[PDB]
Amino acid sequence: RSRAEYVVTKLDDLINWARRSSLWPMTFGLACCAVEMMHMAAPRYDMDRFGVVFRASPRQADVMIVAGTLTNKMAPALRKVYDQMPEPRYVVSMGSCANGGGYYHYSYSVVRGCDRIVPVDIYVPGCPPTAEALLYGILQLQRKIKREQKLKIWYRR
Amino acid sequence: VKQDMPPPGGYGPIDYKRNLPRRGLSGYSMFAVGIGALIFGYW
Amino acid sequence: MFFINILTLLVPILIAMAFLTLVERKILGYMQLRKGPNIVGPYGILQPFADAMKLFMKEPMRPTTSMSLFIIAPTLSLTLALSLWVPLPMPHPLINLNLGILFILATSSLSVYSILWSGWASNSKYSLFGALRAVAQTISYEVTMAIILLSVLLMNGSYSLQTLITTQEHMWLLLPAWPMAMMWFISTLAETNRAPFDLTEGESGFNVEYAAGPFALFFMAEYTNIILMNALTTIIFLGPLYYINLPELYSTNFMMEALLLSSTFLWIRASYPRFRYDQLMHLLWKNFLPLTLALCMWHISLPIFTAGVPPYM
Amino acid sequence: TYKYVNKKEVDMKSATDNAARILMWTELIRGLGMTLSYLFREPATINYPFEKGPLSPRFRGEHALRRYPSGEERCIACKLCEAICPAQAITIEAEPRADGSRRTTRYDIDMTKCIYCGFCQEACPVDAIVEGPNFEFSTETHEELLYNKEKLLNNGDKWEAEIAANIQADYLYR
Amino acid sequence: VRPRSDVTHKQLSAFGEYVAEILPKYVQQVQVSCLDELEICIHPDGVIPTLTFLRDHTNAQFKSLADLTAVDVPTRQNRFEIVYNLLSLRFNSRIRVKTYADELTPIDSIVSVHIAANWYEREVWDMFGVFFFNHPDLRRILTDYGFEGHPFRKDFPLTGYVELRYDDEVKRVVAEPVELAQEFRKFDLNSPWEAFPA
Amino acid sequence: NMTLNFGPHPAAHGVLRLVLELSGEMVRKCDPHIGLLHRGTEKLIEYKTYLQALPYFDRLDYVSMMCNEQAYSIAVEKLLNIQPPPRAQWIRVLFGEITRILNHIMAVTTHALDIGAMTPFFWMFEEREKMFEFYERVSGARMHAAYIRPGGVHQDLPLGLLDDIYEFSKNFSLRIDEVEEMLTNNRIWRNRTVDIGVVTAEDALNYGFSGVMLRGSGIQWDLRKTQPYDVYDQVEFDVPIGSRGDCYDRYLCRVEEMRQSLRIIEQCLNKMPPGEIKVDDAKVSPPKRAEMKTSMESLIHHFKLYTEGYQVPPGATYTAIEAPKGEFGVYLVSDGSSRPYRCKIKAPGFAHLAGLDKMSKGHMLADVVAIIGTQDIVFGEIDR
Amino acid sequence: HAVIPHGKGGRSSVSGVVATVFGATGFLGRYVVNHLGRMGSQVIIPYRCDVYDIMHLRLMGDLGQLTFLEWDARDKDSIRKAVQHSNVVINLIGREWETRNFDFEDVFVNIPRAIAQASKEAGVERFIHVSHLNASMKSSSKSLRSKAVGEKEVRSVFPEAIIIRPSDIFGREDRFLNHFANYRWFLAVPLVSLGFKTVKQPVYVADVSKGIVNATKDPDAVGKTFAFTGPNRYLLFHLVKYIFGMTHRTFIPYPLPLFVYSWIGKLFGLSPFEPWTTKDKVERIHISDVMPTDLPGLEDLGVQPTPLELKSIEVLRRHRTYRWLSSEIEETKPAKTVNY
Amino acid sequence: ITHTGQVYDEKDYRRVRFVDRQKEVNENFAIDLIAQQPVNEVEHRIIACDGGGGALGHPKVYINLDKETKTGTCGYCGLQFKQ
Ligand SMILES: CCCCCCCCCCCCCCCCCC(=O)OC[C@H](COP(=O)(O)OCCN)OC(=O)CCCCCCCCCCCCCCCCC
Ligand SMILES: NC(=O)C1=CN([C@@H]2O[C@H](COP(=O)(O)OP(=O)(O)OC[C@H]3O[C@@H](n4cnc5c(N)ncnc54)[C@H](OP(=O)(O)O)[C@@H]3O)[C@@H](O)[C@H]2O)C=CC1
Ligand SMILES: COC1=C(OC)C(=O)C(CC=C(C)C)=C(C)C1=O
Ligand code: SF4
């Protein structure tokens, strides 16, 4: 087909496939939910298998997984690093301590959620969110990206 | 009502010691094969 | 034709360059009890193309920093590495140069700048220092790297890489000169900033501020180099059998030896912790340079008193 | 009882042995052999969507509110599930239903607040609130994670068959 | 019932007198808890002297400081109760020396006696506000850089008075007075019936 | 000495604003910053009942999830003068040790990842994984179990766990052996680790190191042998003391306690008694659910225990165990109320970090990375 | 229909303003949602940009304060459901470029008239319509002339609908200030009449936003056509140089006939991807600011304007070279004010 | 609407959250389910009500079905018992 609509959608998809197949994460590793992510990186549940690299610096990172309490002192940093990433960037909040406040919600030093400091795309629940659950959450980010249609909106704009 | 307990007579024995094996070609023998290779190569 | 012969010798290497990252992310995997990337495409074959497209699409942040240099550094890194494949004598070379190994030594030396330029270009008190590590080690390892070649040449008779195919028609130059092969292999590991010798960028260099397209170009460069240096080991020390009647068994064995030695630095990476910055220079200036300079003299003496002075040409 | 982890002649045989170790990198080659060995071992990873990592009956996972077979919801709003929740997650307010029975008008588990301790599972006298097996409930928006009585009751109806099997397996232990 | 070994209760009691005699000054109310634990109590001025004797005495070597803490009894005139828990590797024993400090009456620092205290003393200042003279470098260890107020004081609100969010207008994180969306439910738990003390 | 504010994502557990002044590649002074993970754990506990503060302890240092819980347990049991039942004690030592392995696999393999060796982590994280599964099949949670409660364990072991904690133990050794063939004698591990961060014996006691860090310097102190807690007295193990204390020696010590813990686990499987896993005092331990659903005194005791609490008698205690990192102690002051008054957690780690300054002197940037590893710093325990 | 305002005034509090805001993704918009969210108002943000782009707005709103509904301008039904449950509708729908599928008249006049018609049907208490300052049906730039046509129509679809009419806006991410500063790439910075006789009065974005928000919560504004203007006027010359001044980049004002220059705008306009300059822009830029004669805006609506020099440092800092970024505004020289 | 009847009026704001979305409500509304439960006839004056399954039920209570006038209803199951 040559209708430019079918010409575009297809192109967008390719773009989405590339970003969704290779997501390079970065793990601030606040707290413990970091241990449950290292497990994902580990052999039972290989993250790489999916195209997720075990480690990445902020410049080269597609997704930031905030694992653990985002305390008030670390809150300015989180932002900095979120602000130091590329134009196509995403945030997967991991842990009840970062989805909301978690056990430490009423504390004076804990931000009640990272979505008060960085926009969050997928919220993975559980105190130590199971590694399979993170993997489920990373896979749902992949379905979120697949649906994104950036060029078709350009074309229809 | 049953309670998970060690099997009767106890379990078998486990290893708690490193079993790393000190296996290697002896040094003189190692050097001789190498020097012999260079001598043949030079000739 | 010559143009076609430029596509071949380039694309083919670029496509192979992409498949090395994949065979790195799987061989490291199986060594660490994990499948590695197999879900995108079949058995992960489409995996290298996928992040290439993700890398180019993401914003070249160009943080900000001196721009021109930020764009000369990756261009130089890819240009020199792909350029050094121009003279490799896989069977017949493409551009046969009478002083070929000096071309390879000189072109490698120029890549140290890209590290220096990228480090200065990012405006980071810390990144700037990171480039210093690589630039210093590169020239350092270059000094033994060059002397090790001079020992070789004196037993080959010329600087042209094409002569070694005639020098190694009866025996690999590993048998003789094995002591330097090892020292060429370790130096090849340093100059490609691979693991045992990858302090640079271990944490603490010249990719810090580099993302998307610039990241990719050096990136591509490193891996192409990873191959090229391994290929130079597979011509200079492991001489593939050459039959003038059928030239491809030379390239077939060149293919096999290059892949295995390329596999070896992948295997080295997973197997060893990274050396300390001074530990690294302690090796070259203390452990290797005295060995190399002395074995250099032995290779000016072996020819003369064994009446084996090599035939020029 | 103690042990010395690292507490410690020069003979050609010995030295030549030691010098070869430094010169030809003998121990380094030993390390390479180990990794080559595993390269040949079967990888332990599981296809995540197709094959799932095993979880036994006590896995706490995602909250659900059960119902009596008849169809009457088990909770009778004693509200000690609220009392023992460590994170203050469960909010319960109740009033006598027209039937005259005691039921919760609003039961809200804030899952982002919840740290999945499993004490609520423990505390309930009628065992109305249970830790359900599902762990995959990641949500695009923060509001979806906050759960009211209708989501939990719906969660309870969906997973009741497995919840009943899980409680069946572990109740003797408790 | 715990497996009490009276053998201990006595030996530690005997040491408690020993110390009380050795330092009649600065030491009062020395008592061995029913938990086979000694808790010499010293006047705040005896901080340096009592510790040093325990760190360097042949019959009582208490080389490492397990912990330095400050309970806060608001009722007590001297609000804080600095407690130093010390361990004897040689005698396989432990002792507690606890002093009292009010908010603006500083205690001496023992960084000299044990350098372990360099950090814990900073921790006590940050949380409770007690000040330690002669400290090498007192400065907040746990609280935020701009935090106002000492948090573990019983008179400090749990949620605190400030919380942080990112504001686009100013493109920077910004404190605001705390506004909570579900206040901490303050369950009253004490029962109006006591337990006849054994 | 240009401050590099070296730190946050660095090579620490997320938070180390390790601000450092470095003349080129030499470290002149290290002033670690802390509190990037302060969360209020000590103040929050004052507002919670004893049983609802148990989950906080698992989060204090969560690599060592349970061993921490044992310290609060012991502390609350002492204040009540109640002691667990015999089977529960062995359990706590069984899962106490399994947890030590879990911590050492974390400490040794994460140490290497920062050094640059990455294959040991994947090798042993698979073994870790297998252990987590024990936790899950005993507690319900992979980590953050809440299994060890103040009066014993929560629920008896599933019918079959012991057998599997055997198969694993029977093999784990080889897995430690492998790591060894990769790092103990690597011609390169030794260099980056040997003679780095040597700590004298007198200085280690002075700065309150109290852990492998002391044991590595040759001081013989294992609170598990010196002051036995639970039934660690009935087992027989050898403390792995070290000489020429340095990063390499202590490492060897941590690999040796992984070995010695397998010796303690074996015994626990061989000799765990038939019995109950929680004190029979409904006063302290919650009544069994069959009992609370058929007996009035049990419901009343279930209702009061869950809603109000233990009501510990007034007193204060400092109880220290030998958590994998080092001495973990809880000073729990308690009024007669059901909710504690103070609970300072002594973290093996607040003392160790402080030593970073006195250990990393005249050292390169890479040396600092090696020393943070040899202290097993989990910022949860330090920040509390 | 109302929501008693309870709370202390910050996030997690209630103000009772449910408001559809169709063009929130915009530079002005971003700010409008900021205050509305800060105040605690219920904000419904219709969007047709992809979800990734709308993410920045999520964090300033409290939980449940912001609802994002999809919407298409050509599809009348989408506007219908957006205003279903809103009681305040704010229209910020404009684009200075004329895109292939939406012509200047359609975005400025057709889309607002339909939107206003919908809320009269819905029963929204008040509608705020935003049109550019100095806008007359026989003016120079079509954009402005059209916008002028628009303010009229919407009055008939929605009577007593407030019509704030802002001047070109000064703010980070604005064009007025960044555009000129970005002339750096151009070696020479063309300025019609050498940047003279086009006195301009900028207005900080926030002032505009706060003003707009205050309108939503004040009975005094009905049928009012306020004009947020600014705290000081300027001949385009000082503005241009000043900008270059803070940016610390050289200035070469070059005279170039607007005749020929309208052509340069045409050139960029030709470009497919968001033309940087617009024929309609050019005229606008050299379209002199009109003296305030309409209803007073800022101050009148409760916010004291903020001088340009005060916050200019923040807007132009990124335009600056690596060096000179620590240069601060008070050591630098503030340009003179020409009221003319 | 729902078990309790939570509902939003036309003028009611706070109903927008459902716009283009769905609300969580329950079929099998319990209010009517026990009413649908037959009256457990018994012989004895008093009867128990484990809830069914003992440990897997409710803390046992004994109901006095002593007056046919009223079918005792265990406060936990809402099950009416017909003497
Ligand atoms: C008549 C005869 C005339 C000739 C006489 C010849 C006499 C016999 C030969 C003598 C020299 C033999 C060895 C030469 C190479 C080794 C030189 C050397 O000493 O290595 C340096 C270093 C030493 O280790 P270290 O402990 O740091 O130093 C101790 C002393 N300071 O070692 C290292 O640190 C190595 C680190 C290596 C990291 C990567 C390891 C990769 C291992 C696998 C690849 C091995 C090479 C494969 C080569 C394939 C073919 C090219
Ligand atoms: N900044 C300025 O130059 C000034 C502007 N104004 C007025 O204020 C209003 C806001 O200004 P500003 O924020 O700069 O404008 P923007 O250029 O930021 O655009 C405002 C919004 O309008 C939306 N929009 C544009 N075209 C369409 C369309 N065809 N259908 C649906 N939505 C559309 C855009 O959404 P999306 O991009 O997602 O499609 C954008 O979010 C403008 O309408 C303008 O008339 C007044 C004075 C100065
Ligand atoms: C030994 O310390 C470290 C951690 O704790 C184990 C981390 O979580 C992290 C975070 C990294 C991941 C992959 C969670 C780093 C970098 C680290 O150095
Ligand atoms: S959520 Fe549970 S696990 Fe993740 S950080 Fe907070 S506490 Fe640790």
Ligand code: SF4
């Ligand atoms: S405890 Fe069980 S029954 Fe009592 S309220 Fe909480 S949930 Fe409903």
Ligand SMILES: [Zn+2]
């Ligand atoms: Zn019943």
